[PDB]
Amino acid sequence: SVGIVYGDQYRQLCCSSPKFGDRYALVMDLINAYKLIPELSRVPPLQWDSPSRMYEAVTAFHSTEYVDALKKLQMLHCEEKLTADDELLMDSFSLNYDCPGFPSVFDYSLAAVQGSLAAASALICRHCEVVINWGGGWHHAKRSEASGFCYLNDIVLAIHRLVSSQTRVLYVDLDLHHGDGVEEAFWYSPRVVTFSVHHASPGFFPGTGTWNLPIFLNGAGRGRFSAFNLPLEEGINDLDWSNAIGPILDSLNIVIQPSYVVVQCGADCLATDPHRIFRLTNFYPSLSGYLYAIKKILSWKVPTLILGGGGYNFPDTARLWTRVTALTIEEVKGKKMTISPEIPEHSYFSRYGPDFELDIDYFPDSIQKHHRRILEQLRNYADLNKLIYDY
Numbered sequence: 001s002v003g004i005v006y007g008d009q010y011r012q013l014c015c016s017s018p019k020f021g022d023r024y025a026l027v028m029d030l031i032n033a034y035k036l037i038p039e040l041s042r043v044p045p046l047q048w049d050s051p052s053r054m055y056e057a058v059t060a061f062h063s064t065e066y067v068d069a070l071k072k073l074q075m076l077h078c079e080e081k082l083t084a085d086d087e088l089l090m091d092s093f094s095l096n097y098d099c100p101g102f103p104s105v106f107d108y109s110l111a112a113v114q115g116s117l118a119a120a121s122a123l124i125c126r127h128c129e130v131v132i133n134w135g136g137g138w139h140h141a142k143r144s145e146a147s148g149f150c151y152l153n154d155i156v157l158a159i160h161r162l163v164s165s166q167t168r169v170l171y172v173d174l175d176l177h178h179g180d181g182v183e184e185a186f187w188y189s190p191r192v193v194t195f196s197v198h199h200a201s202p203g204f205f206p207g208t209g210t211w212n213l214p215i216f217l218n219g220a221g222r223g224r225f226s227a228f229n230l231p232l233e234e235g236i237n238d239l240d241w242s243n244a245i246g247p248i249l250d251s252l253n254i255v256i257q258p259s260y261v262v263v264q265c266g267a268d269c270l271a272t273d274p275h276r277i278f279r280l281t282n283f284y285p286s287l288s289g290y291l292y293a294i295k296k297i298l299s300w301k302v303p304t305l306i307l308g309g310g311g312y313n314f315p316d317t318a319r320l321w322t323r324v325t326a327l328t329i330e331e332v333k334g335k336k337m338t339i340s341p342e343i344p345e346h347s348y349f350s351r352y353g354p355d356f357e358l359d360i361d362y363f364p365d366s367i368q369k370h371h372r373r374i375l376e377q378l379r380n381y382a383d384l385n386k387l388i389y390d391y
């Protein structure tokens with residue numbers, strides 16, 4: 001079955017941040033509006049027996065000091081009164097600037113972890129073949145550092161639960177940004193292979209995922225050659241992105257043979273994202289770069305976690321994730337999903353004006369050298385890890 005994480009309180013938490021506002025609500029109500037929900041098994045977010053059990057789960061990656069500071073940030077933003085020492089404390093964890101406090105910052109951040117932990121449990125016990133969590137995918141958070149409005153790294157904790165269930169996880173990062181927090185977390189782990197395709201250019205966040213004549217770092221220790229990156233120039237379209245990543249995806253699957261696949265599907269590569277860096281669409285006849293890669297990943301028949309992430313055009317993010325969800329049902333259940341090109345009536349119908357159509361409103365050597373580099377890294381990785389496969 002295909003699982004999707006949601007719940008009444010989970011929705012209210014996911015909609016409580018000043019940055020993402022009610023995006024999660026639009027995504028889930030558009031999915032509802034298209035009658036996809038009866039086809040999906042609802043995965044309820046995880047909850048814990050006690051504060052200690054929560055801390056034990058979250059500090060499997062984050063430090064206790066960082067979790068303590070994040071909880072204290074939330075309590076401090078629930079009174080009107082910050083002191084010089086509390087500001088210094090928060091600064092030492094980068095709980096400032098693009099990662100500010102707000103009254104539910106901790107409850108909001110924990111919710112994604114609860115969602116993505118429960119999603120991995122549903123995969124582990126084989127209740128679901130694929131689980132979707134559109135409240136998750138916060139790939140930039142570090143052990144003791146918030147970064148890019150990511151406060152707790154639900155992806156790292158979910159992957160940790162998968163490996164602790166030989167076990168090998170392939171993580172695929174489709175977000176416009178380099179997935180630096182997941183990469184760094186498994187820098188030294190061969191069992192979790194990380195692959196991010198992203199824009200990277202001088203001064204563009206977070207700065208990593210590219211040349212470092214400089215060279216590509218790719219892991220350390222026993223994890224050498226286990227972190228893959230494909231940085232791409234701005235303006236790339238569905239076709240050129242798809243051909244860029246397609247062969248890399250198949251190659252990684254053949255050689256690594258993952259037990260699980262974790263996909264971050266950040267929607268900020270859309271041609272209509274306010275970033276206006278990539279020109280991907282949600283079209284499904286050329287073919288959406290996202291849908292191409294998801295269908296490929298799903299054709300491998302590996303139990304798979306699908307996460308959200310970036311996406312700052314909220315209706316168009318919903319437009320994409322709705323089609324991603326519909327596609328996942330088609331590929332997993334073998335059941336045709338018919339999606340009208342017009343947005344159905346429902347709660348947020350007015351947000352889809354003025355045309356109210358499901359397509360986003362858009363009129364549409366470097367890579368060959370990266371392919372050879374990445375091919376060599378994979379052979380280096382397979383030799384190091386004694387993996388069998390046909391050259």
Ligand SMILES: O=C(/C=C/c1ccccc1Sc1ccc(Cl)cc1)NO
Nearest residue numbers: 098148175177205274275309310312
């Ligand atoms: O998406 C991200 C990160 C988002 C982000 C990072 C640094 C500062 C602000 C942001 S949020 C942002 C930025 C630009 C525009 Cl145009 C709209 C929103 N990674 O997954």
Ligand SMILES: [K+]
Nearest residue numbers: 173175177197
């Ligand atoms: K990415």
Ligand SMILES: [K+]
Nearest residue numbers: 186189192226
């Ligand atoms: K790794």
Ligand SMILES: [Zn+2]
Nearest residue numbers: 175176177310
């Ligand atoms: Zn992003």
